[PDB]
């Protein structure tokens, strides 16, 4: 017998060093292992052959000339076919389909949220840089004026008046209080300044954390239906866009209503180039495709994608041989023999995951980590000041 199959990703691909390979040892993949299992159970030797056209199977509207995998089966160049091919009412008439082995669905593919490592100084975010600058200038000007009016022809020396101004802002009481009227009035305004700046910082940081925790990612297709910022488009032509046109559903009719009228062309010609458009946007564009292809794209190649949400559409792959075949009997039951015992499930685990190249909500240490560097650096200078004034005396 002869096997008619198509080359696409992990199902069928030519083996490494294909120049030094002859026969069935020239190919490797998922469908390769499936062809080996069924040929033993039914009992016939096979010969693997790639399709001539390179298409799945479609008939021209004028002349009924079937081009692809099903076209080679109609007149009968090969015995049976093992390829990822969906079942349709149009396909069921001309070619006889067997029981489904793997179930597929339409799912969502977005750019994987990168591990947002917090800034080592991400605790000075509430107040802008030009405010932090003017607090330092004010602190100097307040102490100098206090120093002047305190001692005039007094405990508030140039060293002591500088120590009083820090203790007031840090909210750590005081050692000595201004005694005169001129010293009291400048002390009262510095107390009024401190109380507002501190209370404004706490209230803004409270608002910053409250907003950040009450955000939800694009989970279900309902979340896509009520969003305009994050765009979503399908292939230019296929079974995906054709389903969307005659979609008599809840809010998927409104989904296609938005898809038709867009500023740029949301519909992408190439599927692989369509995956690049999601990478380029970086959390601005989403791409809808089959679940089986979506899961494999996350594993192989650099990791910047993931599957999200449940399956939307219901479609299944199958094994096809033209109607009036005596090969339907033993093959259809063999497919059920593989599934129930668990041959397909072990094999699907191997080529996707085993042959793959990928894989508490309290305040973290990293958010506060910055203020510990300020604590150590201060004690570093403290030791040096003790080192200098010991050598002097």
């Amino acid at each position: 017998y002869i096997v008619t199959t198509i080359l696409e990703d992990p199902y069928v691909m030519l083996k490494k060093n294909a120049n030094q390979f002859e026969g069935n040892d020239r190919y490797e993949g998922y469908c390769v292992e499936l062809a080996a299992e069924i040929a033993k159970h039914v009992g016939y030797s096979y010969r693997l052959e790639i399709v001539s056209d390179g298409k799945y199977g479609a008939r021209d509207p004028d002349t009924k000339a079937w081009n692809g995998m099903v076209g080679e089966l109609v007149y009968g160049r090969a015995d049976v076919a093992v390829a990822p091919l969906t079942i349709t009412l149009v396909r069921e008439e001309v070619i006889d389909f067997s029981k489904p082995f793997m179930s597929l669905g339409i799912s969502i593919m977005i750019k994987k949220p990168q591990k947002s490592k917090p800034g080592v100084f991400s605790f000075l975010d509430p107040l802008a840089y030009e405010i932090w600058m003017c607090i330092v200038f004010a602190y100097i000007g307040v102490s100098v004026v206090l120093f002047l009016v305190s001692r005039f022809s007094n405990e508030f020396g140039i060293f002591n008046s500088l120590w009083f101004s820090l203790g007031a802002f840090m909210q750590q009481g005081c050692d000595i209080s201004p005694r005169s009227l001129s010293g009291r009035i400048v002390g009262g305004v510095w107390w009024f300044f401190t109380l507002i700046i501190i209370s404004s910082y706490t209230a803004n940081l409270a608002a910053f954390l409250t907003v950040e925790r009450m955000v939800s990612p694009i989970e279900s297709a309902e979340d896509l239906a009520k969003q305009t910022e994050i765009a979503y488009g399908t292939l230019e032509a296929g079974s995906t866009k054709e389903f969307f046109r005659r979609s008599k559903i809840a809010v998927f009719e409104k989904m296609w209503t938005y898809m038709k009228s867009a500023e740029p062309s949301v519909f992408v010609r190439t599927t692989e180039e369509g995956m690049i458009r999601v990478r380029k946007s970086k959390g601005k564009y989403a791409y809808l495709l089959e679940s089986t292809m979506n899961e494999y794209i996350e594993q192989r190649k650099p990791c910047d994608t993931m599957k999200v949400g449940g399956n939307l559409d219901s479609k299944g792959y199958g094994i096809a041989t033209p109607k009036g075949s005596a090969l339907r009997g033993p093959v259809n039951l063999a497919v059920l023999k593989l599934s129930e015992q668990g041959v397909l499930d072990k094999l699907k685990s191997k080529w996707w995951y085993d042959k793959g190249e990928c894989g508490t909500s309290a305040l973290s240490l990293s958010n506060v980590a910055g203020v510990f560097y300020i604590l150590i650096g201060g004690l570093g200078l403290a030791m040096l000041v003790a080192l200098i004034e010991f050598c002097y005396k």
Partner: protein
């Protein structure tokens, strides 16, 4: 000895304030626009050197305080009279009320300067972000010196009186 160090710092703080209001390098906004205080100078494009004056026009009152650099110029007038007051104490000695006057003017120069900074940032603010040029930090450095010159002037007044 320390009184001679006060004169050098007085002229230094007087210089840095004069360079600040002279040079047009206070802000950058987007190609590249090296604007100062009185004249907005453009670079990298059509006209490379062709500059023109600023077209500015409760909210009305702050606009005229920015349009006329009233505070930073006052700071310099207080400062240069301060250094003059120290020179007036050198000749005709033993007055016991000379450097005191200067010390107040240096403190007043910084307290005038600190307003001029706040007004400028308030006027600028109404996406590419603005960056502060070198000639702005000249105004920032002048405030620190004048404050140090102010406290030095108090120490000399205490010494002669006691």
């Amino acid at each position: 000895v320390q009184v001679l160090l006060t004169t050098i710092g007085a002229f230094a703080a007087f210089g840095l304030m004069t360079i600040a209001i002279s040079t047009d390098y206070w802000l950058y906004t987007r190609g590249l626009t090296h604007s100062g205080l009185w004249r907005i100078c453009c670079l990298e494009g059509l006209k490379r050197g062709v500059c023109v004056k600023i077209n500015h026009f409760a909210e009305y009152l702050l606009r005229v305080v920015r349009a006329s650099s009233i505070f930073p110029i006052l700071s310099a007038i207080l400062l240069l009279l301060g250094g003059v007051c120290v020179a007036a104490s050198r000749v005709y000695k033993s007055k016991r009320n000379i450097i005191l006057g200067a010390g107040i003017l240096f403190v007043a120069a910084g307290l005038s300067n600190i307003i001029g900074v706040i007004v400028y940032i308030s006027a600028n603010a109404g996406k590419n972000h603005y960056s502060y040029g070198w000639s702005f930090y000249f105004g920032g450095l002048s405030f620190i010196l004048a404050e140090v010159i102010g406290v030095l002037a108090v120490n000399i007044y205490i010494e002669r009186s006691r």
